[PDB]
């Protein structure tokens, strides 16, 4: 428990501490007191101070203290829309719905507000991936036409037939 | 292999529909050469 | 790559395929060639999830794939799959896919033309107007079913013809934007 | 298989279904297939 337990409690306490609304930056010593790890080794103190508290993607050094990066975390409809837009523009791809719901409590309000602007991809594990709905080129069809399209086989043809059908009918 | 066919040059599964397409294109002369009475 | 090709590809993909296919195609549109591993990490799709989508794109041959083999820095063999969009086959396959609908649509019209009119209400068997006279019984003076020895109906054959014809007609009306894009991309 | 095609089931599912259909058709013609199980009548008796 001495090695990982102390650092884990730092992360768990700091993560939960933010949920209390205390967005003000915190020091390692303050967290060590709140976690009762004042007896942590001198080398462990500096190690956490120099590595664990700076390399985590959710901790930022501000005036020598550590903060939860409120700008990075998604907690509003505008951030959700802009992030999906910018991610789509740069071809970065989608973002898991759980990443937003864990970041923004009751994300459904923001999700339902954007509505069709959010494209939901359901993964084999039922998880949803969110994508930006770029409305540049749009087209949609009836289920009957989508069924007709699926009914027309395309793969069971050779290049000869693929081109022959064109000239066979006149195009 | 088993009950299905492969084509290798580099390997693909060869489906009965694709074989059906290929065979449907075979001419009468090729059937005679193959010793198959087309009728 | 003319924008008309990109617009056509996006219209047909978003029109008759799911967003997964469109997003994957947009990647191949944004970049001429992208590795399968890159598309996988970007889309965050599972291997079978993306592979099946890519297999579909392989089925319609809208995209092409080439395999590159090289030795990694640690000495392990590496085989990367590079995917790219083949607008030539895409335009050719959609032209077939669309002119096949016309054949299938007119086949459905010919079916609506050939769908037998008479039918037996007991066994739910449909009889052709040529066969109905063969099945006619002079003693009763009306059509009957040999298996059921019961009256044969004729009026219900209009309902399926009317209903299907609406779908066939509405299909031709909605498909015109893609046909216009094709006329713009024939070159 | 018809419903799987009408429903647009997964390719691997349809492939396995066709592979199963292929096995049933083959076994019905010949039960003496190599490398394949003998089709029993649920009582230890091989089907003719
Ligand atoms: Zn009857």
From Swiss-Prot, chain A:
Residues 1-75 bind DNA. Keywords: Acetylation, Disease variant, DNA-binding, Nucleus, Phosphoprotein, Transcription, Transcription regulation. Signal peptide: none annotated. It is found in: Nucleus. The modification N6-acetyllysine is found at residue 3. One of its GO terms (biological process) is transcription by RNA polymerase II. One of its GO terms (cellular component) is cytosol. GO terms for molecular function: DNA binding; RNA binding; RNA polymerase II general transcription initiation factor activity. Changing residue 116 to Y: In TTD6; reduction in the levels of both TFIIE-alpha and TFIIE-beta subunits of the TFIIE complex in patient cells; reduced phosphorylation of TFIIE-alpha observed in patient cells. Belongs to the TFIIE beta subunit family. Tetramer of two alpha and two beta chains. Interacts with FACT subunit SUPT16H. Interacts with ATF7IP. Interacts with SND1. Part of TBP-based Pol II pre-initiation complex (PIC), in which Pol II core assembles with general transcription factors and other specific initiation factors including GTF2E1, GTF2E2, GTF2F1, GTF2F2, TCEA1, ERCC2, ERCC3, GTF2H2, GTF2H3, GTF2H4, GTF2H5, GTF2A1, GTF2A2, GTF2B and TBP; this large multi-subunit PIC complex mediates DNA unwinding and targets Pol II core to the transcription start site where the first phosphodiester bond forms. Recruits TFIIH to the initiation complex and stimulates the RNA polymerase II C-terminal domain kinase and DNA-dependent ATPase activities of TFIIH. Both TFIIH and TFIIE are required for promoter clearance by RNA polymerase. It is linked to Trichothiodystrophy 6, non-photosensitive: A form of trichothiodystrophy, a disease characterized by sulfur-deficient brittle hair and multisystem variable abnormalities. The spectrum of clinical features varies from mild disease with only hair involvement to severe disease with cutaneous, neurologic and profound developmental defects. Ichthyosis, intellectual and developmental disabilities, decreased fertility, abnormal characteristics at birth, ocular abnormalities, short stature, and infections are common manifestations. This is Transcription initiation factor IIE subunit beta. The chain holds residues 72 to 242 of 291 of the full protein.
Curated annotation (Swiss-Prot), chain C:
Transmembrane segments: none annotated. Belongs to the TFIIE alpha subunit family. Zn(2+) binds at residues 120, 123, 145, 148. It is found in: Nucleus. This is General transcription factor IIE subunit 1. Signal peptide: none annotated. A zinc finger (C4-type) spans 120-148. Tetramer of two alpha and two beta chains. Interacts with TAF6/TAFII80. Interacts with ATF7IP. Interacts with SND1. Part of TBP-based Pol II pre-initiation complex (PIC), in which Pol II core assembles with general transcription factors and other specific initiation factors including GTF2E1, GTF2E2, GTF2F1, GTF2F2, TCEA1, ERCC2, ERCC3, GTF2H2, GTF2H3, GTF2H4, GTF2H5, GTF2A1, GTF2A2, GTF2B and TBP; this large multi-subunit PIC complex mediates DNA unwinding and targets Pol II core to the transcription start site where the first phosphodiester bond forms. The modification N6-acetyllysine is found at residue 58. Residues 5-95 form the HTH TFE/IIEalpha-type domain. It comes from the Eukaryota. Recruits TFIIH to the initiation complex and stimulates the RNA polymerase II C-terminal domain kinase and DNA-dependent ATPase activities of TFIIH. Both TFIIH and TFIIE are required for promoter clearance by RNA polymerase.
């Amino acid at each position: 428990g001495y090695k990982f337990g102390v650092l884990a409690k730092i992360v768990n306490y700091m993560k939960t501490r933010h949920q209390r609304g205390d967005t003000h930056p915190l020091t390692l010593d303050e967290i060590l007191d709140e976690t009762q790890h004042l007896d942590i080794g001198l080398k462990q103190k500096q190690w956490l101070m120099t590595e664990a508290l700076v390399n985590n993607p959710k901790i930022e050094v501000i005036d020598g203290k550590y903060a939860f990066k409120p700008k990075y975390n998604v907690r509003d409809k505008k951030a959700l829309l802009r992030l999906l837009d910018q991610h789509d523009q740069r071809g970065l791809g989608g973002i898991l719905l759980e990443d937003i719901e864990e970041a923004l409590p009751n994300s459904q309000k923001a999700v339902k507000a954007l509505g069709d602007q959010i494209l939901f991809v359901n993964r084999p594990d039922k998880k949803k991936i969110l994508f930006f709905n770029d409305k540049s080129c749009q087209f949609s069809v009836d289920e009957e036409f989508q069924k007709l399209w699926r009914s027309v086989t395309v793969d069971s043809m050779d290049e000869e037939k693929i081109e022959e059908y064109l000239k066979r009918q006149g195009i | 292999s088993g009950l299905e066919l492969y084509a290798e040059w580099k390997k693909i599964l060869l489906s009965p529909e694709r074989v059906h397409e290929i065979f449907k294109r075979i001419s009468d002369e090729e059937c005679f050469v193959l010793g198959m009475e087309p009728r | 790559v003319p924008a008309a090709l990109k617009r056509l590809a996006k219209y047909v993909i978003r029109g008759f395929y799911g967003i997964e296919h469109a997003l994957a195609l947009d990647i191949l549109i944004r970049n001429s060639c992208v590795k399968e591993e890159d598309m996988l990490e970007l889309l965050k799709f599972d291997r079978k999830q993306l592979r099946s989508v890519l297999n579909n794109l392989k089925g319609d041959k809208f995209i092409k794939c080439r395999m590159r083999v090289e030795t990694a820095a640690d000495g392990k063999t590496t085989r990367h799959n590079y995917y790219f969009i083949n607008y030539r086959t895409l335009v050719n396959v959609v032209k077939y896919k669309l002119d096949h609908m016309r054949r299938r649509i007119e086949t459905d019209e010919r079916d609506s033309t050939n769908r037998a009119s008479f039918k037996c209400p007991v066994c739910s068997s449909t009889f052709t107007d040529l066969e109905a006279n063969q099945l006619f019984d002079p003693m009763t003076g009306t059509f009957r079913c040999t298996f059921c020895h019961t009256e044969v109906e004729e009026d219900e054959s209009a309902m399926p013809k009317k209903d299907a014809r609406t779908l066939l007609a509405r299909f031709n009306e909605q498909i015109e934007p893609i046909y216009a894009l094709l006329r713009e991309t024939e070159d | 298989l018809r419903r799987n095609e009408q429903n647009g089931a997964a390719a691997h599912v349809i492939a396995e279904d066709v592979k199963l259909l292929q096995f049933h058709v083959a076994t019905m013609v010949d039960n003496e297939l190599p490398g394949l199980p003998r089709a029993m009548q649920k009582s230890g008796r091989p089907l003719k």
